[PDB]
Amino acid sequence: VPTARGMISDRSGRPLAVSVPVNAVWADPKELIEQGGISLDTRWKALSDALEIPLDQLATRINANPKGRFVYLARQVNPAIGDYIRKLKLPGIHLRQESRRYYPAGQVMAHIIGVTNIDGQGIEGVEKSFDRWLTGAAHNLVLSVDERLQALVYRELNNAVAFNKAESGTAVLVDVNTGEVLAMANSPSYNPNNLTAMRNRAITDIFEPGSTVKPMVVMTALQHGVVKENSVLNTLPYFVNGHQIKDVARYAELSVTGILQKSSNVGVSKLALAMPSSALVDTYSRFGFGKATNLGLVGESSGLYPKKQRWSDIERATFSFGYGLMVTPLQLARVYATIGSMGVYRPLSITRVDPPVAGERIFPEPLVRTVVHMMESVALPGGGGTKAAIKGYRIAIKTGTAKKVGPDGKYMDRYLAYTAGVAPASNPRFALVVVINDPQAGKYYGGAVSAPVFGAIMGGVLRTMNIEPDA
Numbered sequence: 086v087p088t089a090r091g092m093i094s095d096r097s098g099r100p101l102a103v104s105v106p107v108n109a110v111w112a113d114p115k116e117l118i119e120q121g122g123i124s125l126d127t128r129w130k131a132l133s134d135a136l137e138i139p140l141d142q143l144a145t146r147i148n149a150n151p152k153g154r155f156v157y158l159a160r161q162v163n164p165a166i167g168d169y170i171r172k173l174k175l176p177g178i179h180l181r182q183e184s185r186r187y188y189p190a191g192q193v194m195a196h197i198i199g200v201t202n203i204d205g206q207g208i209e210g211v212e213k214s215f216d217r218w219l220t221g222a223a224h225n226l227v228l229s230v231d232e233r234l235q236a237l238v239y240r241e242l243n244n245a246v247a248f249n250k251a252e253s254g255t256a257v258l259v260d261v262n263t264g265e266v267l268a269m270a271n272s273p274s275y276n277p278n279n280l281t282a283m284r285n286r287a288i289t290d291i292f293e294p295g296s297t298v299k300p301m302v303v304m305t306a307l308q309h310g311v312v313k314e315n316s317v318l319n320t321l322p323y324f325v326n327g328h329q330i331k332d333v334a335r336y337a338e339l340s341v342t343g344i345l346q347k348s349s350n351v352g353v354s355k356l357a358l359a360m361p362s363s364a365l366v367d368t369y370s371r372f373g374f375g376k377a378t379n380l381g382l383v384g385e386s387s388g389l390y391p392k393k394q395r396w397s398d399i400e401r402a403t404f405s406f407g408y409g410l411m412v413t414p415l416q417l418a419r420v421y422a423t424i425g426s427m428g429v430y431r432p433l434s435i436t437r438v439d440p441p442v443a444g445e446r447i448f449p450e451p452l453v454r455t456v457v458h459m460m461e462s463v464a465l466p467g468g469g470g471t472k473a474a475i476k477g478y479r480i481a482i483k484t485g486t487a488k489k490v491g492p493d494g495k496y497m498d499r500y501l502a503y504t505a506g507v508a509p510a511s512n513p514r515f516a517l518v519v520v521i522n523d524p525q526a527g528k529y530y531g532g533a534v535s536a537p538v539f540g541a542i543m544g545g546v547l548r549t550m551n552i553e554p555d556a
């Protein structure tokens with residue numbers, strides 16, 4: 086007896102979850118199979134044709150849960166069809182009027198909203214997370230998400246995940262000033278409306294962040310007076326505990342700007358090791374690695390973050406290019422939302438907030454702005470994320486290509502294609518993260534696979550949200 090629930094809408098009042106009164110068709114599979122099941126009787130073919138579901142499909146549906154007391158055949162059917170199925174007098178076949186939890190945004194919001202079980206209780210996402218609030222007593226819900234921006238985000242992600250024959254992808258878009266989650270999409274998705282991964286990868290996948298950490302390494306080293314903006318480091322291959330740190334793009338020297346521009350592993354390893362192990366552990370913590378995101382969603386992880394007090398020199402180095410910790414995509418979005426605010430760590434929410442929103446200062450504004458300005462180099466010529474460049478706007482991004490660690494702690498030649506960043510870089514409004522998990526179609530670098538998807542998404546965002554261009 087599934088009854089009407091409160092309405093879930095986006096930040097502007099666009100419906101995403103609506104309770105609609107319908108006549109639905111269900112089978113009592115136990116009662117159906119005892120009463121002779123799907124026999125040679127011609128009324129069964131009359132049902133199939135009327136439901137537009139061939140017999141094989143219909144037999145499968147009922148044989149799945151043989152002693153079950155409920156399986157949907159149609160969530161929705163017009164009186165005409167519903168009256169004709171009733172008049173067939175098929176034992177185990179039932180019409181009943183109910184409320185259909187209908188999702189007008191479909192597979193696009195699926196992971197955020199979730200679905201309900203047969204009885205009508207939320208079992209995933211917001212639908213579960215706010216189930217009591219919604220059920221009646223019964224309350225409408227106004228999410229922080231924007232349907233136009235979720236549509237743009239998901240469409241660019243889904244496409245790119247298909248083109249690159251990737252295991253999955255996730256894109257998170259965060260308001261720099263409010264901490265609101267404007268978009269949160271995953272590919273692959275599912276259709277929550279039909280009879281037919283369902284976990285929100287953005288809060289459940291925990292990944293090694295890889296080279297996306299490097300903007301925080303540069304920040305720490307500046308504060309610790311280890312280097313100055315215009316400093317130049319020897320970036321030649323060298324040894325750390327008998328392991329070789331070498332760069333992909335071979336460069337003899339590199340400025341601090343150059344280290345983020347070229348993505349220098351040697352560069353950031355030398356910055357880490359000119360400081361105590363605790364420094365990068367404090368800054369990543371300050372930026373919210375190893376900390377709950379607190380959105381109340383089911384399976385929401387805080388990842389794995391080191392609390393060891395005695396690091397090896399190779400561990401310190403690998404931590405400077407994002408190995409030794411596991412973070413959710415949402416956790417990474419908040420890092421870039423904090424970079425974007427120029428060092429103001431704000432809490433996340435999936436519900437519309439009344440601005441302003443208080444934040445905690447973790448780095449001094451001009452320190453962060455200098456490093457944001459350095460990050461403009463990555464999408465400018467000479468940089469590794471030029472493919473993310475947006476016409477008429479300045480952007481502060483960092484690419485990443487993380488080696489994927491296996492069940493047994495050992496690294497595979499399978500990759501997480503990363504692009505994270507902030508825009509416009511004059512006055513950031515939007516933090517965006519894009520991770521493609523295990524691209525298998527040829528190119529695998531973040532700069533080659535995720536950079537372009539970042540560009541496409543951030544472009545539409547800036548234009549949808551009517552943001553004054555930047556150069």
Ligand SMILES: *C(=O)[C@@H](NC(=O)[C@@H](C(=O)O)c1ccccc1)[C@@H]1N[C@@H](C(=O)O)C(C)(C)S1
Nearest residue numbers: 295296333348484485486487488530531532
């Ligand atoms: C950060 O992600 C860096 N990548 C690596 O450390 C490196 C590795 O983990 O062994 C690597 C992975 C894949 C191919 C080559 C090397 C640096 N930044 C990356 C990026 O921004 O795309 C690279 C690949 C340029 S190196």
